[PDB]
Amino acid sequence: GLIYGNYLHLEKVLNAQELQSETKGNKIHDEHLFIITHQAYELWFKQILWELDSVREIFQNGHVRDERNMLKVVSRMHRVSVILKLLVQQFSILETMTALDFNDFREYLSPASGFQSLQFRLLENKIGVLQNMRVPYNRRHYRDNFKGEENELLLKSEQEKTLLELVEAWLERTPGLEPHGFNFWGKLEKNITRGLEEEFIRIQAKEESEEKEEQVAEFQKQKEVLLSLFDEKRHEHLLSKGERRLSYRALQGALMIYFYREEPRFQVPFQLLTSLMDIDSLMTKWRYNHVCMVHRMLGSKAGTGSSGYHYLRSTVSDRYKVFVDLFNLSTYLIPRHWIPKMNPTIHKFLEH
Amino acid sequence: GLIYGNYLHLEKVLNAQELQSETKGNKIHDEHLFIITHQAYELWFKQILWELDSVREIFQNGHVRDERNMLKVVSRMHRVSVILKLLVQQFSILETMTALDFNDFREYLSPASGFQSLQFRLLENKIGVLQNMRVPYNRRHYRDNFKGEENELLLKSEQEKTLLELVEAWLERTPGLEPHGFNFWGKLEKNITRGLEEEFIRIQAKEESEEKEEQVAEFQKQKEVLLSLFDEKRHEHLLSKGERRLSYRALQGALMIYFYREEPRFQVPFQLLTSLMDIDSLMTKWRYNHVCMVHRMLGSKAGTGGSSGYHYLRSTVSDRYKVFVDLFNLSTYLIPRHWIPKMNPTIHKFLEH
Amino acid sequence: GLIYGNYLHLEKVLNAQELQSETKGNKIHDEHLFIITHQAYELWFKQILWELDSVREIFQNGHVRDERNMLKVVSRMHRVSVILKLLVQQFSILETMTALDFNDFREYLSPASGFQSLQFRLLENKIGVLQNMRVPYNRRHYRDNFKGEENELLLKSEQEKTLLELVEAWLERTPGLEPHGFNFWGKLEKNITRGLEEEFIRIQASEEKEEQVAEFQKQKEVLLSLFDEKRHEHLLSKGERRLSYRALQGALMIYFYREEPRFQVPFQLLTSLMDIDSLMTKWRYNHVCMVHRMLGSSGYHYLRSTVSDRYKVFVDLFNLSTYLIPRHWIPKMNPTIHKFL
Amino acid sequence: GLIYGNYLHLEKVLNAQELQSETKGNKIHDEHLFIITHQAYELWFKQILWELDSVREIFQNGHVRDERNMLKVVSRMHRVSVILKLLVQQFSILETMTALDFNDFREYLSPASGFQSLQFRLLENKIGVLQNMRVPYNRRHYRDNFKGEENELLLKSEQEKTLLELVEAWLERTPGLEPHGFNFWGKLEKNITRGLEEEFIRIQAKSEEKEEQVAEFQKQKEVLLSLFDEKRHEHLLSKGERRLSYRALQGALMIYFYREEPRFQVPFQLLTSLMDIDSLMTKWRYNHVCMVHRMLGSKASSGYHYLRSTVSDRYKVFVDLFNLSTYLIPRHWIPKMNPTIHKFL
């Protein structure tokens, strides 16, 4: 019957280590670590792609409409963030290689680079990094480096629906936004307008003081920010600039989930939103730890005469944060008592 | 020109994932995680073997005699412990699989098991786990599973010099033990004997009391422990039982390094000893985390035949599997600093770089 | 104006470090690390108690009956396990102290011990460690080591409802167990009986066969044992189990129907309770390994004894893995009744 | 007899938790976590200061001259980095607080901020962050927020010798730099010059491939030869783009290249550890940024944007140790150190 090594195809996995230093008659011990570290990253990238694809499919094929499937969705997205955390920690292993020792085999690698990781690109694309928003390296598209079936795979990855698009569509259907129903947006605008009015009166009532002056200034900022939320044209503009990514309606859905997270139907949805932010934060942390290591190994100016260091530093940016809108919902937090009430009267549609 | 995927042989690594659930017409999503997790463990086991073999070779071929090589030795042993820590954390990934989901593909795995990891066994053997100390599973030898070249490799792993044996030989050469020289052992025995004598007199002077008895009783325990160190015959006996692993002379070398760790020639040696203990501790932590997960997935009774896997694995979390137990137990023989034989520059020339 | 240091009462927190080595005219550098490490453990124990008490209260006052409160419950229990993981990692700091350096100030500590952590005991009791199940230290009860108000607090901690008891009561009310309703237990027994019957027949149709026969026999005994309420009561008496038979039924209902909307967050709670038990055990294990490294080959053997199912409060949740069946044996839940969850 | 609680002064530590939400008649559960998290950070900052001060003192009092003390030095610096790692992981606890829940007690905190952590500033100063290099927040000096004894302490922290300065002095005394002795710098310049000559010949002996090699050679040549420009170094020192004296830089490179030599093994570990502390300090700052973002948004001079600015070489004290990787050469170019000339090492 089945044996461990055969089941795991270890005849492949453990016969995939060839030191170029050794192939060229000058074996360097630490090259082995370099190979294994990358192979382990690639195994885990494959696992992340497997989870991510399964979740994309749940959205894309309509299964997510049945809320029974939310546990699996959140459990798999949580699993992705648990793997990503391990991948961040994994840099600690390669940090046991000194720059001096790396320098003894670096020449035998040229011109290969991590830039050519198919899976890393697939992962970026499938989460929803927009091609127009990528920073070019040496004034080139990232995919220009790939050919054949690999280029085909990358194209599919760009053309098929991303996790961002699939979550967007689902957020747009969030219960409670219906004007004929709970009319979340209408009530929210009204309550925020009234809340600001009340606050203005409170501040104006205060005795002339430095404190008052500050409160006035703060109020003015807060007022502008909160009212700006209801400007759909500003949203479209920011969407155009890439400072936002979600449709206006999806943003409404996300805020509905945020404010009514304790309501039973929104509990697991809220966890999903939290998890999407976690993935974005951990992807950025991966990129940051990668940058620090490139610096430690090559210096601040080495790279393909573009500085790899500086290109990579540019990737550590909201430009590569797909669910940046979920983070920015913090900007629009209001006092709890301003949140449109959901009494049992109307608290029927958010029970399981 | 060399390309990433070719250099890393990703055509092998990323085409090694076959779900038995799918091969048998009933694909179960979480099986993929189970495969990848194990493959990642095995890659890192290969890396640990590569580091450990390189260090064994440095000892075995005499390179360690040139102390310029101690930095490399300690850096590679430190690297092994950094990998082991990652491997302990890696269980957190498999903990995202529920027992209920594992149960949907478990049947398609039988009768394969992690028990059949060649590399894990190679690692245990090369560090220095003794075959006669291993606990039998279902009243069977661990090697009974393996056949052909695999069984051959395991035998070599048992017959070749282990890390423990190679460190032992090097410890036996530790400077300072020469009776004609610094005479560490003789001076230590003398100072401990005198120190105990002095302490006894202090205690005896006290007036008969419960407190005095307690002090007297404590002194007697401490006395027995410390003096037991100089009983070479007791050591040989305990070595016979497998309760100790290092030769008496190697034990002397280790304690020399412990007590004179700050002396320049002993600084990196001390770090090495620390690192060997770290590896033992992390190997045990791996075993423990593995146990907790087997329990969560299979329950306390599930296992091959009437034997419980859980209970066998629990049994592996024991000093029986701690190769450098003697290095840990040197803390038992701590004395006041002023009892430590002095090493004035006059007699320090030998421990300078 | 509120200032950081005043808000955090740093005049207290950062003036609480007194080296006994220094008080006795022989300052030892590493003693400072020993003090801070323990103070950090105690701050986090206080936080764990704060979370755990808030959750006990949500159960005890009936708030948990409104399922709107489940997110907060699971979020706070998850928070406890996140803190416990940090506390496990925190041992890595104290591991930078050698045994030789510890030995230079150890004498000045006597006769104080970590054993006397009030908060650690409060935490054990509030989770649900039973006093009669504790391993004796020096042939005596753990509480004998405490006096005054502290002894009083520990008694309250034992007498007040534990997390285990409060979860138990909630599990007993789990929807689906009603014989007049979905009749989970009845259907489960029936389906397991049938499933075993079917398997036997297949088996009856070789070395392999012998093995499968053996397996079947073990599985059969185990699965049928689940329906023996008397054996359960006996094991409860021996302390080998902790939850009532009815609570066990509730937990299995949640396990099997975890995807059903009303059970999704409850399942996360059960998962989290096991996590806390596992991390508490890991804390105890890492503590043992450190004591060994510091003192040698005994407190060591008493501590080793605490790394046991004896101190696993939610051991019943772990052991439900033993009673997993093929998915197709699980009583079906369709719209006919599905709506109840 | 001493009791645990008394020894640890738990009557202070465990009676230091006062929720402002509760003081103002509206207790918010998560405020307790916010307080404890910060108190735990501050305990560990105290420990880091205690280790760092002990190491500064070993340098400053001449004890480091006795190489017996290098193990203690490196062990304590390693300990600092192990604590810093825990402090980075500790953010995972505060991340279990949602922004919505933080928003329920945030108002009761105003106008307090982590910016007012005395110990964090003391730590920055004692490692060697320069005041003139700090980025202003809201067009203000960082110390403007401190008064009394606290401001006094911060002054001393700036005036007293920093870890950077103490390491610098020790690096300047590194064996091997003597022109009358092993003459490291002279030999290195000579070997690099010759090595470049040899490579040029190979290039001349040879297309776009050749052209690429030509371009590379030119870049490498400029970089490597720039190392021997003492004047450029002094200029960059003036700007604050470098921190170590030219002589200290030579000492560091000596240790780098001859790390395996017994006398340099633990010194090399020290240099590695100093870089680790810089990396971990930056990682702390970055994890802090990500959290502030999640909690306040990108707008709430935005704190988020100021903090992002602190993740920069501007705050990297041992940047020179990192940048020595730029000046790596083939091993065979490194001046040989035969036992003959090894006795000193």
Ligand code: HEM
């Ligand atoms: C010695 C360690 C490392 C060095 C020196 C290094 C160097 C670099 C450099 C210079 C680049 C920029 C592209 C180029 O100029 O060729 C790059 C990009 C990249 N590296 Fe690494 N790398 C290291 C480790 C790793 C590891 C362990 C991974 C894991 C898979 C990795 C994955 C990547 C990826 C995916 C990119 C492209 C990132 C992007 O375009 O945003 N590298 N690396």
Ligand code: HEM
């Ligand atoms: C679902 C997760 C896991 C389960 C249920 C599991 C189960 C078991 C069981 C029952 C045994 C005892 C042997 C037997 O009865 O066949 C065992 C041993 C073993 N497992 Fe696991 N295991 C799991 C994950 C892993 C992983 C991730 C590794 C990593 C390589 C691993 C490596 C091993 C090894 C090396 C042994 C032999 C250990 C020894 O003999 O001391 N297992 N496992």
Ligand code: HEM
């Ligand atoms: C040098 C480090 C440590 C040593 C040598 C040590 C030693 C011991 C010993 C010997 C015991 C058994 C009781 C006794 O005989 O006194 C004990 C119990 C205990 N220690 Fe530690 N300990 C250390 C660190 C810590 C730390 C950092 C904590 C954190 C709070 C801690 C908490 C405890 C607790 C709570 C107990 C009672 C455990 C139980 O009864 O299950 N210890 N310790």
Ligand code: HEM
């Ligand atoms: C809810 C979590 C947190 C938020 C929202 C937060 C927010 C901020 C903000 C906005 C700043 C910029 C200064 C200001 O605008 O007042 C800041 C700075 C700072 N925070 Fe935090 N913080 C948080 C947690 C922490 C924690 C856990 C620490 C640990 C002690 C901390 C320590 C600091 C320090 C030291 C600074 C000054 C850093 C520098 O000047 O480079 N904060 N924080």
Ligand SMILES: c1ccc2c(-c3ccc4c(c3)nnn4CC3CCNCC3)c[nH]c2c1
């Ligand atoms: C496999 C193979 C190589 C890599 C690298 C990688 C990327 C860039 C590197 C490098 C290694 N060594 N030096 N550089 C800089 C380039 C600059 C242009 N000229 C050639 C060297 C990362 N991961 C890998 C996996």
Ligand SMILES: c1ccc2c(-c3ccc4c(c3)nnn4CC3CCNCC3)c[nH]c2c1
């Ligand atoms: C690859 C393949 C299998 C494994 C296991 C593993 C070990 C024991 C297992 C198991 C999986 N599932 N059930 N058991 C218990 C046996 C007991 C005898 N009857 C059949 C099931 C761990 N790692 C692996 C890697």
Ligand SMILES: c1ccc2c(-c3ccc4c(c3)nnn4CC3CCNCC3)c[nH]c2c1
């Ligand atoms: C504060 C003060 C002391 C401690 C300890 C602790 C516990 C036991 C210790 C110890 C330190 N040093 N030696 N022992 C062994 C004892 C055991 C009982 N019989 C006498 C020797 C842990 N945490 C602390 C906090």
Ligand SMILES: c1ccc2c(-c3ccc4c(c3)nnn4CC3CCNCC3)c[nH]c2c1
């Ligand atoms: C103790 C007390 C407060 C803090 C903070 C902190 C920092 C900035 C904060 C905050 C809490 N709540 N809101 N803000 C935004 C302010 C920034 C300045 N302009 C007005 C809004 C961090 N650690 C602490 C410890």
Ligand SMILES: C[C@](N)(Cc1c[nH]c2ccccc12)C(=O)O
């Ligand atoms: C029926 C539904 N699952 C409704 C839905 C959409 N988005 C949501 C977010 C939270 C809660 C529910 C929803 C669907 O249309 O998918």
Ligand SMILES: C[C@](N)(Cc1c[nH]c2ccccc12)C(=O)O
């Ligand atoms: C020359 C020598 N390296 C001496 C030696 C042996 N063991 C040691 C431990 C610590 C310090 C030195 C030694 C050798 O024989 O290997």
Ligand SMILES: C[C@](N)(Cc1c[nH]c2ccccc12)C(=O)O
């Ligand atoms: C009304 C109820 N919340 C029902 C209940 C009890 N235990 C459960 C477990 C999972 C799901 C629901 C329940 C209550 O009685 O608390």
Ligand SMILES: C[C@](N)(Cc1c[nH]c2ccccc12)C(=O)O
């Ligand atoms: C005697 C000496 N410890 C020499 C010294 C200085 N820097 C070094 C770096 C590495 C090795 C030795 C040194 C001292 O002057 O401190």
